[PDB]
Amino acid sequence: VFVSNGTHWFVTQRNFYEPQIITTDNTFVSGNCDVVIGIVNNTVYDPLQPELDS
Amino acid sequence: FAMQMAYRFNGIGVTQNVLYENQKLIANQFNSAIGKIQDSLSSTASALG
Numbered sequence: 001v002f003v004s005n006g007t008h009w010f011v012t013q014r015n016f017y018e019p020q021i022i023t024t025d026n027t028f029v030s031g032n033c034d035v036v037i038g039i040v041n042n043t044v045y046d047p048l049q050p051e052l053d054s
Numbered sequence: 055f056a057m058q059m060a061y062r063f064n065g066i067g068v069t070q071n072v073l074y075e076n077q078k079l080i081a082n083q084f085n086s087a088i089g090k091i092q093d094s095l096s097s098t099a100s101a102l103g
Contacts, residue, residue, distance in 0.1 A: 001055070014061070027071075028069075028071075030069075030071035030075065030093065031071070031075060035074070035075045036077075037056065037074070037075045038056065
């Protein structure tokens, strides 16, 4: 599930609060932001970015 | 409740984006199907058989 500690957005396993920083590894894409009732804006981190920035 | 029903979809092996991208359709089908229960129970006493 996505959750917020009031400042930052995390994804957690459902049955035990363990906050993981949101990435392309723990999330999957579908479509665009128009179709969903209740979607929120946030960054999603790309683990390949610092590997490509080097 | 739209996030609970996205767990219910994940449980049956339908990927949860299928709910959020069809949420008005799924809500209107649930609301219409709840409408049919009233007509069934009102019209046909042998439903309680």
